[PDB]
């Protein structure tokens, strides 16, 4: 089941719908894909078969 959403996830008593920074965080975070890294941070293209 895929899930695409950009809604802010709240982690406090106060509700978050369009405010973030103090206790609510953006759900997406980007990979820092660089070739200067070693083995455990390289981008691996993974394809599945079901």
């Amino acid at each position, epitope marked *: 089941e895929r899930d695409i959403s950009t809604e802010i996830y709240q982690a406090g008593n106060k509700p978050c719908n*369009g405010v973030a920074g*103090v206790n609510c965080y*953006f759900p997406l975070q980007s990979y820092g894909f660089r070739p200067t890294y070693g083995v455990g941070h390289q981008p691996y293209r993974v394809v599945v078969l079901s």
Partner: antibody
Amino acid sequence: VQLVQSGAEVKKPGASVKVSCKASGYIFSDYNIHWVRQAPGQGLEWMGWISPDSDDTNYAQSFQGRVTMTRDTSITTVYMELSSLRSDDTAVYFCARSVGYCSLNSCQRWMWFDTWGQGALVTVSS
Amino acid sequence: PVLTQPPSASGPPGQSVSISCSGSRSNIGTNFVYWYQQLPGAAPKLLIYKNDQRPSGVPERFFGSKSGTSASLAISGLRSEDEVDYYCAAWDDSLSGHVFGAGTKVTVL
């Protein structure tokens, strides 16, 4: 590194003007570029971005058919074309390079213009 | 869309002055906001990225942070470099691209 660009001069309205930006030193297959203009009496304005390793093209919400992008990978230059120049467009166009790489619409949250280049003032008067 | 900025903010040397940059619900509060300054007759550079840190070659006196839907920038020490203008760069989804403020002019008493 240096990000020198070539300017133009005054011209009649409604024609086409050619400005180019040249890149050197760094490899021109990993960094996106951004094009911003700065007019006297107002702040900076954004138009769009392209990719040197792909044919990605994005436009602003106000400039959809007025401006078109052109890429030259082998020459390592980028060519900007402005069509149907108005009266309130006398600005300084800056060739700005951003670190990282983005192609999706939502990718642009982490983009900052790190290495700027010197701008040139262009005007359109008949 | 665009962001509201004060046309002119000034402060005497020896202390710090604050520059505010407000925003809407989809301008600041869901995306990062960046601070840009430019010398007169030159190119802009980078001061603040990801709202907390600075690049190399930047003194530690330049600090900025945000709490809610607005961000503030504080500068301490105004002798020759803080007379330049500042810009409030952010990102949104309505214009589908980078948006900039009107511009803040900083002087000294």
